[PDB]
């Protein structure tokens, strides 16, 4: 929780690129229609 407090108080934006070790075809599943998505970053653990 102290990590949460120092994160939110500092105003840090904790959004970064998609994980690469999860087996996702991250280079292929990005398209800014049929079955793709137009976002390449979100909050991830």
């Amino acid at each position: 929780p102290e990590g949460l407090w120092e994160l939110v108080d500092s105003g840090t934006d904790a959004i970064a690129g998609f994980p690469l070790d999860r087996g996702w075809d991250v280079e292929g599943m990005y398209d800014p229609a049929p079955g793709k998505t137009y976002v390449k970053e979100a909050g991830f653990l």
Binding site: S10, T12, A14, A16, G17, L20, D21, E27, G28, E41
Partner: protein
Amino acid sequence: WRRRQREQSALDDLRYKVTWKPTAVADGASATGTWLVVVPESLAGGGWPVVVARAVDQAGGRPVVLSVDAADGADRSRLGLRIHEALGEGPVPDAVVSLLALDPSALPGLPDVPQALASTAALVQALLDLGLEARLWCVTSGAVSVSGADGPSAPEQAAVWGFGRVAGLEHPHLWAGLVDLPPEADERTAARLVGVLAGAGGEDQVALRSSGVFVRRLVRAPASEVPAVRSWKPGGTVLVTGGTGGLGRQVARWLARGGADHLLLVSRRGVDAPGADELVDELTDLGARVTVAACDVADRDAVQRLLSEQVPSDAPLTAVIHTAAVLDDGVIDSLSPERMEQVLRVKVGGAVHLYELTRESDLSAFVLFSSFGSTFGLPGLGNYAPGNAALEALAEQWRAEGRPATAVGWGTWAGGRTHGIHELEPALATAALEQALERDESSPVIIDIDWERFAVAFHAKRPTRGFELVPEAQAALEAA
């Protein structure tokens, strides 16, 4: 049909690229003993030096601020005297932190060498001279681009990164790694910096940004599924530096074999080269208008007059392939600023001069021939890597400016790395470049590897986690 399919399979089986995997912010540890921070005096007390000094202060370590004059950083012996007298009357340092790469300036007297690379070379070989056992870390600002959100990467710190990558594989104990930093200095970023610096190891090549922390890895990027666009058409004049050589010969004959209007070969010797007549005979056999030139591309005036007088008026310049440089092999001990100057005079000076003389004529493409040593680093390639590494950063700078540049990384063409990487056949390499050209890949890596031997040998030379996203690399590592 079957021939084309088998060729495409075998060609996509040897495609690679480099990416920046995000990773979780490590818990880190506490700084122990005393850490020796070396800084350029041009910065003085500005941003990063004061902040990282404070960061190591509250991390439990003892800072040692060592301001260095701009001229002093070049010489290894003078830097040895400076580091010895600064470190005198005290305990030996546990680790060394180098902010020397933060200086954005060139070396006076040797104008085509950055102060960053020369300072880094001086520091490493000075620490070799002093016999210190302290692990070395070098921090850079804006040296690499982890994502499209980043700005273009500068050439100097990219050369530093290449030099560090090659150096680490032959001095594992001294060289720990590199840590890129964002443009501005912040307390939280410096806290994370000292945290990763105090870590055990393994994360040699990392970068820090506002979003998080990233680590450099290598991935396969096969071109089978990528659609094509803006197909390759060598119309007009096409300039090829170092045409008389081997790589120049291969790329010239590849250009001629299909849709070549005019091939302007440039070399220091040109006609006098051993096989210029024999080469140009077969090259003009394919209906190519060949005018081999005899001039150095390093000097600005020579290229300036060559782009005016030797260019046909019936064929404007479209493509500019840059595959010329001197092979000045040298071990880390024997490296000196003059060798770096003569190598960078051609590897970087020619390319940047050719680029700058453009912006008045549209170019279809601007190819640069980096080596796989920049991506990997090999023993003995101390002087070879930095120019190759700077070539990519020049490429991203040019795409940021909005020109069609490419920084193709090459293995060993079939024409001193017999272990690991195999010799690429000429036709396969040419086809790989052909398919990469229209796909607008900013940094392909066309190299053939037998991971049965390459991965285990590379790990034995230095353990690393760069080759983790390649499944063959993981199979080879866990096999042993």
